[PDB]
Amino acid sequence: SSSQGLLGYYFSDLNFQAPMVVTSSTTGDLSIPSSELENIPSENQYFQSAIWSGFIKVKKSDEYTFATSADNHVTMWVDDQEVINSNKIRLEKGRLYQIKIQYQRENPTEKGLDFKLYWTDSQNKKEVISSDNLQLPELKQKSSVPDRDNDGIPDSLEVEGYTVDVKNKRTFLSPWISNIHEKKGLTKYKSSPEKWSTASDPYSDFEKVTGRIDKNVSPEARHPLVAAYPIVHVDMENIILSKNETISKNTSTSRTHTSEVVSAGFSNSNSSTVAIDHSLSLAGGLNTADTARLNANIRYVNTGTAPIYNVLPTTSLVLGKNQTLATIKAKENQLSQILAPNNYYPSKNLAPIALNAQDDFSSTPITMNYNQFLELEKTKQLRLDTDQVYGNIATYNFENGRVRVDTGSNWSEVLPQIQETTARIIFNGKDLNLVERRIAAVNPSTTKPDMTLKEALKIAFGFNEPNGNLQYQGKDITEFDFNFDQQTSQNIKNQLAELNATNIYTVLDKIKLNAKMNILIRDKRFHYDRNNIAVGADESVVKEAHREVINSSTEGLLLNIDKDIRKILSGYIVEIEDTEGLKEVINDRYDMLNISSLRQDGKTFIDFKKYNDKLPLYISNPNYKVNVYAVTKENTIINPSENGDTSTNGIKKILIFSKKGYEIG
Numbered sequence: 001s002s003s004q005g006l007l008g009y010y011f012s013d014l015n016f017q018a019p020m021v022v023t024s025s026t027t028g029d030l031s032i033p034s035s036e037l038e039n040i041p042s043e044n045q046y047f048q049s050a051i052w053s054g055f056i057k058v059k060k061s062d063e064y065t066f067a068t069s070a071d072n073h074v075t076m077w078v079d080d081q082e083v084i085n086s087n088k089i090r091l092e093k094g095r096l097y098q099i100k101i102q103y104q105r106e107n108p109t110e111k112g113l114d115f116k117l118y119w120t121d122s123q124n125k126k127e128v129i130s131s132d133n134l135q136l137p138e139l140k141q142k143s144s145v146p147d148r149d150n151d152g153i154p155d156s157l158e159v160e161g162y163t164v165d166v167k168n169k170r171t172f173l174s175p176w177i178s179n180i181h182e183k184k185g186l187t188k189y190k191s192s193p194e195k196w197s198t199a200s201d202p203y204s205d206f207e208k209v210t211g212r213i214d215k216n217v218s219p220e221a222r223h224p225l226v227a228a229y230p231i232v233h234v235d236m237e238n239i240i241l242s243k244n245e246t247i248s249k250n251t252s253t254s255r256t257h258t259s260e261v262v263s264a265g266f267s268n269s270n271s272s273t274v275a276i277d278h279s280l281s282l283a284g285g286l287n288t289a290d291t292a293r294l295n296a297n298i299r300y301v302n303t304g305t306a307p308i309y310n311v312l313p314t315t316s317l318v319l320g321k322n323q324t325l326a327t328i329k330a331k332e333n334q335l336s337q338i339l340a341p342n343n344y345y346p347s348k349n350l351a352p353i354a355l356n357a358q359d360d361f362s363s364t365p366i367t368m369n370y371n372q373f374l375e376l377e378k379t380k381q382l383r384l385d386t387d388q389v390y391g392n393i394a395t396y397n398f399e400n401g402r403v404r405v406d407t408g409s410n411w412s413e414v415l416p417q418i419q420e421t422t423a424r425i426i427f428n429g430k431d432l433n434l435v436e437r438r439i440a441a442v443n444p445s446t447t448k449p450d451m452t453l454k455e456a457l458k459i460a461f462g463f464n465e466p467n468g469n470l471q472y473q474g475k476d477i478t479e480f481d482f483n484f485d486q487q488t489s490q491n492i493k494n495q496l497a498e499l500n501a502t503n504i505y506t507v508l509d510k511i512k513l514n515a516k517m518n519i520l521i522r523d524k525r526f527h528y529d530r531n532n533i534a535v536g537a538d539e540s541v542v543k544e545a546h547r548e549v550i551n552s553s554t555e556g557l558l559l560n561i562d563k564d565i566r567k568i569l570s571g572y573i574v575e576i577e578d579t580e581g582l583k584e585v586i587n588d589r590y591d592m593l594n595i596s597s598l599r600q601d602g603k604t605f606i607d608f609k610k611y612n613d614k615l616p617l618y619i620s621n622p623n624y625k626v627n628v629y630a631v632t633k634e635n636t637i638i639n640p641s642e643n644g645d646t647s648t649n650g651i652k653k654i655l656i657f658s659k660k661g662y663e664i665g
């Protein structure tokens with residue numbers, strides 16, 4: 001508990017107008033050595049005034065006399081009862097007494113401040129007040145030292161710009177100073193002087209930048225304009241079907257975002273889609289009055305910016321458009337760990353959660369009638385709808401200076417405000433998964449910081465401009481498309497008009513965000529479905545992606561393929577073409593295309609043996625060709641056609657390799 005003591009404001013001017021340093025002292029020693037004033041301009045290092053605030057707490061009732069290093073330039077009050085300008089004052093045990101210390105000094109010939117706070121009890125024991133008796137003011141939001149929102153940062157600094165510099169034992173909040181601060185690698189902040197939390201979340205602007213916050217809040221959300229909140233969906237890893245009173249397959253799940261009509265949506269609901277493996281795992285009985293049972297392994301996923309402690313959200317497992325087959329619930333207050341941002345529950349190094357645990361004989365079975373099982377087979381897809389019922393928030397406590405789960409703070413009270421006051425940006429550049437972030441933005445309809453689209457991209461997703469050109473990890477911003485909801489689209493379209501700009505990438509630094517916008521940014525190389533899941537890529541892109549052939553034989557192809565490309569590929573078709581042009585498909589079945597696998601070295605191996613009776617391809621003549629085709633997710637057939645055809649005939653495939661027997665060797 002290091003944020004113990006009084007909160008001090010140090011001004012360079014004589015009448016509390018130019019805040020230079022805002023920081024806390026641990027004990028009665030309120031001194032700031034010039035040694036730690038490096039980032040402050042030489043002249044402003046001469047503090048002409050200062051104000052301290054907090055509370056005093058005594059373990060045993062008694063009468064005290066307060067004094068300071070310079071009683072002549074000070075005015076202190078205890079409970080608004082003026083003590084210095086100095087008589088004894090009684091303080092009962094178990095009571096917090098508010099302190100306010102004022103200090104003015106016109107003639108600083110010295111830099112920094114040497115100023116201590118003392119007190120003497122009834123016996124004549126005089127000593128600098130200990131950390132044990134001091135505590136910061138309750139800088140929490142108010143019911144319905146210029147600090148309109150009570151977060152602790154002066155209104156002027158929030159509006160003008162400020163930064164924080166961690167000294168050896170303290171963190172100094174200071175106004176932004178370009179020449180000094182920029183080249184020191186410090187971040188310039190600007191927050192609303194009217195909002196305790198500028199992004200409307202449970203942590204204040206001061207708590208965020210000063211580090212008086214949950215260790216699990218994402219680094220980017222420690223910025224007062226970036227919202228810190230959980231975002232959870234369920235990830236099904238595998239499933240097993242059985243006849244009620246066996247089909248065991250791997251599943252791929254993707255968090256989703258539904259577009260309307262082409263145009264991103266307004267939904268702030270969680271949901272994921274599961275695709276069950278359609279390929280043979282082994283090889284290969286139900287009637288109209290049987291029932292099948294479903295079990296599966298799952299993990300909760302937090303892709304947001306704040307953790308969860310005592311309530312996992314509820315989820316509906318859905319078949320088709322709206323046939324709920326189960327309601328998945330976790331036990332409130334019985335979590336075995338927290339669900340951290342950019343993390344899982346349970347953690348990936350631990351076993352996943354079974355819907356019906358081997359343990360639990362009393363778990364509700366997930367049942368399907370005969371028609372349902374047919375529907376599931378027909379689609380081989382499931383949906384997981386999850387509510388936004390998170391629990392209590394681990395908040396910072398000024399009394400003890402520790403972060404703890406607060407039973408009085410609840411996410412449900414927070415989410416609506418965050419959603420109404422910020423701009424949403426969903427970006428998939430990291431690994432093609434949809435990642436959502438919310439940035440504080442003004443309701444067009446004079447307090448909040450203006451926010452440009454470029455800056456949002458920088459503080460929320462970590463984009464940068466090494467030469468003034470915005471990029472996300474070496475990838476130019478033009479490699480990503482911008483999609484908006486209808487309203488936002490017209491808004492942006494209008495902004496362009498006033499700028500006489502016809503292109504967005506050209507004026508990103510000048511497009512301003514407003515609260516309630518919905519912006520979707522996706523990698524341009526891929527095909528997306530209505531859920532915004534990457535389901536394909538142009539033939540040209542795919543062909544190009546298979547150019548790096550490290551090896552080829554009658555046994556298989558070894559290649560280097562982009563991780564994002566491999567994600568949109570469902571399978572490969574192997575074929576031998578004779579000198580006549582006639583073909584022979586080796587793995588001639590819609591469920592036998594699962595011949596690719598990633599190696600430890602990250603190289604892809606396409607296995608010719610798998611579906612060739614574990615024997616290497618037999619190329620009767622070296623003038624014969626081996627063609628290998630790639631099938632993408634969106635073109636994947638998962639059942640026999642409607643007659644009964646199970647061949648690869650009719651499958652939209654992309655030629656990605658073709659060489660003669662002698663070229664392959």
Ligand SMILES: [Ca+2]
Nearest residue numbers: 147151152153
């Ligand atoms: Ca403030």
Ligand SMILES: [Ca+2]
Nearest residue numbers: 192193195205
């Ligand atoms: Ca504020």
